[PDB]
Symmetry: C2
Subunit: 359 residues, 2 copies
């Protein structure tokens, strides 16, 4: 009935779109007898300016002690020439690690009202609805050893290590099987098991877990083939599970295929703590304060918060329905504007979503 939510407004358009999502979350939850206590905490450039680091401990503490975390965006010109460990992005890596949210869920859907935004033909883009479950805190991005060394003659050698232990594969796979159960019951595990030992172990562990989720249809696909299949017939996918680097690449491809980056939400889940919910778009510093931002991705991230974070299915559906009503009514922010629709600002789009909720 009452949940604790940490808000991380962050940078650029972050505070603006989180403020709207906060209100939508309140109203939708209210209609299901659910109430929230919100606390805003610093992260990213906002934290750098206020505290001097991208992620203060107080923010980690508040996040960990809450039921779920809703983040806006991170990044800005001001901090782009900071040392690496003091860049806003570092705070995002750090809070994922601290919350142990190893599972990144990014749903790529093409909404009926926005089909023509995709560069894919209508009959190919219409009905696309897939979920990339990406291992988020491990693999080659974090693997050791790594470096640039000067070998025995004058010459530099640069190296990185793709590495996963069995338990890291198991836990991301389990989340993917559970996620397929909340969707259409089809899971495609994507790897390079024809050449990489790390992928051979990936496929071995996923294959072994299949018997524990016998209700889910499991298939396997190579990464380069998945990159082709997303272009040729993306409607074939329900849920995809893959490692960090392949998930990064394939999800971004899928996101672009839908055609509307400003619409796309994300969830980052752990085994037993609060999840982290965030739009995948950036901080869009050039339109900050100009009332142009698309709040719908953050609103849909609050819907994922309710569904995947708190198990509040009905409240989440209320949010998703109201977004569809706003789009059905012809309202579009600039990034999704098309002839014959109603171009609106961030605030007005937020207002239109709120009325369908409260209708």
């Amino acid at each position: 009935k009452r949940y604790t939510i940490t808000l991380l407004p962050g940078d650029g358009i972050g505070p603006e779109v989180v403020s709207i999502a906060k209100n939508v979350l309140q109203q939708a939850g209210s209609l299901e007898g659910v109430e929230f206590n919100f606390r805003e905490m610093p992260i990213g450039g906002a934290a750098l300016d206020l505290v001097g680091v991208p992620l203060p401990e107080e923010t980690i503490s508040a996040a960990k002690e809450s039921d779920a975390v809703l983040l806006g965006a991170i990044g800005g010109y001001k901090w782009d020439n900071n040392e690496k460990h003091l860049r806003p992005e570092k705070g995002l890596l750090q809070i994922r690690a601290a919350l142990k949210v190893f599972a990144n869920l990014r749903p790529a859907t093409v909404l009926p009202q926005l089909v023509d935004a995709s560069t894919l033909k209508r009959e190919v883009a219409e009905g696309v609805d897939l979920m990339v479950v990406r291992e988020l805190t491990g693999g080659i991005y974090f693997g050791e050893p790594r470096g640039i060394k000067t070998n025995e003659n004058g010459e530099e050698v640069g190296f990185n290590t793709e590495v996963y232990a069995a338990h890291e594969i198991d836990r991301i796979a389990r989340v993917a099987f559970e996620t397929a159960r909340k969707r259409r019951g089809k899971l495609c595990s994507v790897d390079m098991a024809n050449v990489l030992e790390a992928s051979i172990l990936w496929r071995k562990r996923v294959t072994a877990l299949a018997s524990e989720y016998p209700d889910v249809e499991l298939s396997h696909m190579y990464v380069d083939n998945a990159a082709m299949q997303l272009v040729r017939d993306p409607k074939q996918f329900d849920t995809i599970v893959t490692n960090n680097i392949f998930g990064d690449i394939l999800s971004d491809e899928a996101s672009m295929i839908t055609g509307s980056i400003g619409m796309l939400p994300s969830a980052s889940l752990s085994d037993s703590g609060p999840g982290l919910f965030e739009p995948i778009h950036g901080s869009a510093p050039d339109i900050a304060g100009q009332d142009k931002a698309n709040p719908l991705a953050t609103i849909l991230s609050a819907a994922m918060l309710l569904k995947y974070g708190l198990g509040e299915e009905k409240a989440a559906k209320r949010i998703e329905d109201a977004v569809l009503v706003a789009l059905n009514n012809g309202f579009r922010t600039g990034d999704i504007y098309s002839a014959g629709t109603k171009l609106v600002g961030c605030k007005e789009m937020g207002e239109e979503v709120l009325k369908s909720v409260d209708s």
Copy 2:
């Protein structure tokens, strides 16, 4: 005026399409005062059946002593349950290493006659014409150390090493710069320099080579952004250079974006020896001997052989022009057939190309 060409017919539709490309190469060459000595040598399943290994030494020798190598296809059901080092695919890895062809060139072009084959809208697909220059013999596919080990806890850990030495990056970059010079003078180097040390070194070496090719416009792009840009605006690319694993993924994405896999040729180039030229499609064992294969990719691979392998540009243009004429005249094999066109078999398509050359 006389060149030595090694033919590697290989498996499935390989022999069929190489035999046609051989003749097209002969005729086009003839019209430019160029003649060829051809020798066929075993590789793949054909070598396995004949000699017992995927790549006999005699084939390496013949290839190395020739001016260029034209390969058909490799693979088949018969040998799929062979141990790894005796699979047909091993022979392809082995001949690339032996020939030291570290540069894989894959042109993704959407031909005007075949635009509707792409799942991308016509206005996006029309005019796509890019070249992926992929490092072919190094990186994580071949990197050490690698394996699946059992650690401390009795738990398996799987790992691989993405590694490049400076000289490996320099030589693939140089080929890419030289390739952009033969195209539109634009080179986009693709990496993950925001996170991988190996990519930091990649970007450092490519950036340093720019001053030696000041005529070429160099830009840099992250891999996940490139995967998006191929979907959103593939016409923006001329030449791309990238490492083995990223090149594999992005080229396959680009191939699918063109819509017609059976049309796509490839070249693998070395510093000073014979190149290896091959269609990117597989051996298609289900249509072998049925006169259904599309010979055009192999024919266009022979055009790359002339141009990139031997510097015979006019003869290469003769081949390319004849393919366009065949297509303009409405001829289509099954894989590129559309309503209103003339469905033909492999032989007849070959004949139409040959007619156009010899006129």
